[PDB]
Amino acid sequence: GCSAGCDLALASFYVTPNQNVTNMADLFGIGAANYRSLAPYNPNIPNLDFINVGGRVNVYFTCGCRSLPGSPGATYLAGAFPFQMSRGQIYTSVAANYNNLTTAEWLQATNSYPANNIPDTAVINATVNCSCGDASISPDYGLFLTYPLRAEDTLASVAATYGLSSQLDVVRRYNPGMESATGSGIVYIPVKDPNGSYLPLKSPG
Ligand SMILES: CC(=O)N[C@@H]1[C@@H](O)[C@H](O[C@@H]2O[C@H](CO)[C@@H](O[C@@H]3O[C@H](CO)[C@@H](O[C@@H]4O[C@H](CO)[C@@H](O[C@@H]5O[C@H](CO)[C@@H](O[C@@H]6O[C@H](CO)[C@@H](O)[C@H](O)[C@H]6NC(C)=O)[C@H](O)[C@H]5NC(C)=O)[C@H](O)[C@H]4NC(C)=O)[C@H](O)[C@H]3NC(C)=O)[C@H](O)[C@H]2NC(C)=O)[C@@H](CO)O[C@H]1O
Ligand SMILES: *[C@@H]1O[C@H](CO[C@@H]2O[C@@H](C)[C@@H](O)[C@@H](O)[C@@H]2O)[C@@H](O[C@@H]2O[C@H](CO)[C@@H](O[C@@H]3O[C@H](CO)[C@@H](O)[C@H](O)[C@@H]3O)[C@H](O)[C@H]2NC(C)=O)[C@H](O[C@@H]2O[C@@H](C)[C@@H](O)[C@@H](O)[C@@H]2O)[C@H]1NC(C)=O
Ligand SMILES: *[C@@H]1O[C@H](CO)[C@@H](O[C@@H]2O[C@H](CO)[C@@H](O)[C@H](O)[C@H]2NC(C)=O)[C@H](O)[C@H]1NC(C)=O
Ligand SMILES: *[C@@H]1O[C@H](CO)[C@@H](O[C@@H]2O[C@H](CO)[C@@H](O)[C@H](O)[C@H]2NC(C)=O)[C@H](O)[C@H]1NC(C)=O
């Protein structure tokens, strides 16, 4: 499980036709009015009004350690984005906006209401998995990108895309159960902060 979280994680949001950055900001609790706060995390997107289909946008969030409701002692690391309910909304339609960053089944598992009886006045959480690293794996990496595999993607090919081929062994240790996965599932990739650091971890006591 997890003991505590960290204050920053990133998600790789694949760009589909007619997506826009204010909508991505809204989905991650940033608020449309503050979408420009995404610029330092996306140096390859100099104009946030133009995002190309098939591109990716990095979106930031806080990574909290949460208990899974109704499960025995299970905890997990994720960002939680409150979503105000109204009549007509279902876990499937909430999850649809995040593409492969979450799933209806995972929203059901992380929220405390049964799918078939969510009160119309309640607030549910859209939850996106993250990692904060592990000092016992490496003190070097304290910032991770949540990357949904798609198409032919493998952990090796993704890690190579982010310059991490020579550390692939270490990358595999952050992604247990996904060393053999291809084209589907979420992997966590160490990435550099806007100031160019991997944000090394403090020595635990
Ligand atoms: C086919 C294949 O293999 N794959 C694909 C396939 O997945 C796609 O099909 C779609 O799949 C999804 C996932 O399985 C289906 O999603 C499910 O859909 C059902 C039906 O809509 C959902 O069930 C409804 O859930 C809502 C929300 O909980 C219920 O609404 C609530 O109802 C209660 C009671 O009526 C309301 O409470 C009342 O409120 C009043 C007002 O204050 C109060 O006075 C009363 O006291 C109070 N009553 C009580 C008892 O408390 C409550 O307000 C309301 N909530 C809201 C927000 O409105 C609703 O009743 C449920 N309906 C039924 C029936 O159970 C279910 O939650 C949902 N699951 C998930 C996980 O989201 C989807 O239906 C399906 N689509 C189709 C078309 O079949 C297909 C197609 O896309 O693609 C394939 O590829
Ligand atoms: C930024 O994108 C938002 C999301 O767009 C949706 O997701 C993307 C990834 C892509 O799949 C698009 O094809 C989707 O629409 C835009 O908001 C969406 O706006 C549409 C309406 O254009 C709305 O769809 C439906 O509209 C019918 C109309 O009959 C209505 O009955 C339905 O209930 C439903 O509203 C979506 O709900 C809406 N999505 C969200 C998450 O809000 C957004 O469009 C701009 O804002 C909306 C509210 C309208 O004013 C649009 O006309 C307006 O252009 C995009 N923002 C900008 C600035 O372009
Ligand atoms: C988010 O992360 C949690 C925790 O890793 C995932 O839940 C685990 O899924 C595996 C299946 O690969 C199970 O063996 C574990 O028992 C699950 N743990 C818990 C606490 O439920 C979850 O699947 C991830 N969500 C998404 C959308 O990838
Ligand atoms: C969404 O996640 C939040 C945590 O960020 C949950 O917040 C809890 O809400 C209940 C309301 O009865 C409070 O009693 C708890 O103290 C809250 N926990 C906190 C603030 O850590 C909330 O329950 C989640 N929503 C759903 C639908 O599961």
Query: What is the amino acid identity at position 41?
Result: Y
Task: Check pocket membership of 23 for ligand 2, CB cut-off 6 A.
Answer: yes
Which technique was used to obtain these atomic coordinates?
X-ray
Ligand nearest to the CA of 49: 2
Q: Is 51 annotated as a binding residue?
A: no
Q: Is 140 annotated as a binding residue?
A: no
Check: CB of residue 189 under 8 Å from CB of residue 143: no
Q: Is 90 annotated as a binding residue?
A: yes
Task: Check pocket membership of 167 for ligand 1, CB cut-off 6 A.
Answer: no
Which residues are near ligand 3 (CB < 6 Å)? 68, 74, 76, 102-103, 106, 129, 177, 186
Q: Is 176 annotated as a binding residue?
A: no
The Cα 135–Cα 197 span in angstroms is 16
Check: CB of residue 83 under 8 Å from CB of residue 125: yes
DSSP 198: -
Q: What is the dihedral sign for C-alpha 16, 20, 23, 24?
A: positive
- Measured in degrees and rounded to the nearest 5, phi and psi for residue 116 equal -90, 5
Residue whose tokens read 């906006």:
97
Ligand nearest to the CA of 121: 1
- Sheet of 144-148, strands arranged across: 123-129, 75-84, 56-67, 6-14, 144-148, 186-190
Closest ligand 4 atom to 122 CA: 27
DSSP 98: G
The Cα 107–Cα 109 span in angstroms is 5
Closest ligand 2 atom to 26 CA: 41
Chain centroid, CA 95 distance in Å: 13
Ligand nearest to the CA of 178: 3
